[PDB]
């Protein structure tokens, strides 16, 4: 449905209790997926499944400030499957982003960028077909 890369505005920034849902299908032979929550040119939260990093599947999370990447947080639990449909949910909590894939908790990422109201765009990129991207308050 939707064109990738896709930019989803987050009007007024993120706030605790905001739930973002992304539905799509991983392409065959996919190499990478990325979600980038942006504060202007900075990336507050980069969520990056990698299908083949030295023959391993890994999720890399990080923050980019002033064009420099910080310390990576890596997760070896890998719920994505080439060719198959997925659901990503990102719930904004007071102290972290909480990510679930296919209704199962995956990881939390502590807020490094603390001006939550200034994180006002989400970029979706990589080797997917994107079906829907939306948000709501819970
Ligand atoms: O930090 C996140 C950034 O990472 C760099 S790569 C640096 C390597 O991760 C560094 N590194 C660390 C280790 C290591 C860790 C533990 C133990 C050990 F032994 C070794 N090995 N290598 C990427 O270019 C960068 N990016 C990805 C994309 C991007 C663009 C379109 C689609 C998409 F899907 C993605 N745009 N920009 C970002 O993802």
From Swiss-Prot:
A major expression is found in the colonic epithelium. It is also abundant in the activated macrophages. Expressed in fetal membranes. It comes from the Eukaryota. Keywords: Acetylation, Cytoplasm, Differentiation, Disulfide bond, IgE-binding protein, Immunity, Innate immunity, Lectin, mRNA processing, mRNA splicing, Nucleus, Phosphoprotein, Repeat, Secreted, Spliceosome. The keyword Acetylation applies. The modification Phosphoserine is found at residue 76. GO terms for biological process: eosinophil chemotaxis; epithelial cell differentiation; innate immune response; macrophage chemotaxis; monocyte chemotaxis; mononuclear cell migration; mRNA processing; negative regulation of endocytosis. Residues 6-136 form the Galectin domain. GO terms for cellular component: cell surface; collagen-containing extracellular matrix; cytoplasm; cytosol; extracellular exosome; extracellular region; extracellular space; ficolin-1-rich granule membrane. Probably forms homo- or heterodimers. Interacts with DMBT1. Interacts with CD6 and ALCAM. Forms a complex with the ITGA3, ITGB1 and CSPG4. Interacts with LGALS3BP, LYPD3, ZFTRAF1 and UACA. Interacts with TRIM16; this interaction mediates autophagy of damage endomembranes. Interacts with cargo receptor TMED10; the interaction mediates the translocation from the cytoplasm into the ERGIC (endoplasmic reticulum-Golgi intermediate compartment) and thereby secretion. This is Galectin-3. It comes from Homo sapiens (Human). The lineage of its organism: Eukaryota, Metazoa, Chordata, Craniata, Vertebrata. The gene is LGALS3.
């Amino acid at each position: 449905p939707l064109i990738v890369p896709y930019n989803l505005p987050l009007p007024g920034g993120v706030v605790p209790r905001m739930l973002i849902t992304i539905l799509g299908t991983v392409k065959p032979n996919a190499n990478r997926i990325a979600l980038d929550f942006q504060r202007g040119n900075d990336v507050a939260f980069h969520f990056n499944p990698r299908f083949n990093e030295n023959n391993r599947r890994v999720i890399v999370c990080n923050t980019k400030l002033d064009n420099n990447w910080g310390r990576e947080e890596r997760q070896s639990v890998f719920p994505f499957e080439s060719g198959k449909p997925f659901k990503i949910q990102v719930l904004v909590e007071p102290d972290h982003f909480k990510v679930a894939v296919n209704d199962a908790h995956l990881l939390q990422y502590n807020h490094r960028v603390k001006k939550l109201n200034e994180i006002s765009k989400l970029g979706i990129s990589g080797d997917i077909d994107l079906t829907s991207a939306s948000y709501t308050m819970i």
